[model samples]
Target: PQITLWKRPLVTIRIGGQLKEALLNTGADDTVLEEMNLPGKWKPKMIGGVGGFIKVRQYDQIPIEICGHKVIGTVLVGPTPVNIIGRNLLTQIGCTLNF
Candidate 1:
């Protein structure tokens, strides 16, 4: 699927049997999700972002579906402004640059 880069590339994704829409961030190096009850052992980790750094729950490989495309990777859960999709998962979906 062709994905356009913007302030926020919004997309729907399913995780832990729950559906959530997330913003695809090419500038982000990791996937971050809003705080939610998900199945996984989370370790305390700090992730750097455009706003400096934030504390988040680091979950291991988890199943996720982007626009129906199944993908698995690490997901960070915390007090995020919004659900977000980063490069770690973006590459899995073959997100392209639309010029």
Candidate 2:
């Protein structure tokens, strides 16, 4: 589906049997999810953005259902202003920017 940025591009995604609405952020390089209980071994990582650099956990090759479209990709878990589905997962889902 082609989306216009008139409003935020929020989509429902299923992860770890949980439902979450996340923003399809074209500017973000990596997917960032609000802190939640995801079972797996993850490595500590840091990310920088509008605010500044912060710590996060990198969970690689995790399965997720985005708007019912299933894909496995890396997801960062930490304290974020909002849940964002970034370009990493976006490219897997074949997202393109157009007017």
Candidate 3:
């Protein structure tokens, strides 16, 4: 199934076996989580965006579900305003956009 892209493609996704809402941000290169309590070793990473740069922990092999499709990939955890689903996972789930 194809998803329409608007100002923000928001959807209810499952992460860490928990249901959560996330924004599908094409602008983001990687998925970023607002929380930092995933089960794995993390490395310090500097992420840049709207503001300046903020520190983050890179977590790998995280499972996420969207629209009934399962996605397993890298998820960065840190001080983001909210959870985001980047193109890394977006393309895997066959999500697309149009003008």
Candidate 4:
């Protein structure tokens, strides 16, 4: 079976107490939080990565808006170049990628 994926407009999100704006990449399989900016209390479980199971945290019911649509889900946090907007969000908006 063949599957398609579609890229949507990028959205910005505020992280840490500073509320730094970060670009949201829909192509990412998981949401990543910059190691430096990640909150102290939010410890996510480790997930498989290139090296091994990397430490990852999941945020549940976090408030977010995309193209005027509001969504809440467990956003995976990790150290990455930029934050990601993954399937957890796309599924809420009933959107699918065509790639």
- Higher lDDT: candidate 2 or 3? 2
lDDT per residue (tens digit) for residues 1-99 in model 2:
888888988999999899999999999999999999777889999999998998999999999999778989999999999999999999989988985
List candidate 4 segments past 4 Å from native.
Answer: 1-9, 13-29, 35-43, 49-53
Clashing pairs in 4: 4-97, 5-97, 5-98, 5-99, 6-97, 6-98, 33-78, 44-56, 44-57
Across 23-93, the per-residue lDDT of candidate 1 in tens digits comes to 87877888999889877488989988667888998988898999888998999999889898888998998
**Model 1: residues >4 Å from true position, as ranges?**
5-7
Measured on C-alpha atoms, candidate 2 has an lDDT of 0.92
lDDT of each: 0.85, 0.92, 0.85, 0.57
* Clash count, one per candidate: 0, 0, 0, 9
TM-score of each predicted structure versus truth: 0.87, 0.96, 0.88, 0.58
Decreasing TM-score order of the candidates: 2, 3, 1, 4
Best by TM-score: 2
lDDT rank order: 2, 1, 3, 4
Score candidate 4 by lDDT.
0.57
Model 3: worst 10 consecutive residues (lDDT sum): 1-10
Please list the Cα RMSD from the true structure of every candidate, rounded to 1 decimal place.
1.7, 0.8, 1.6, 5.7
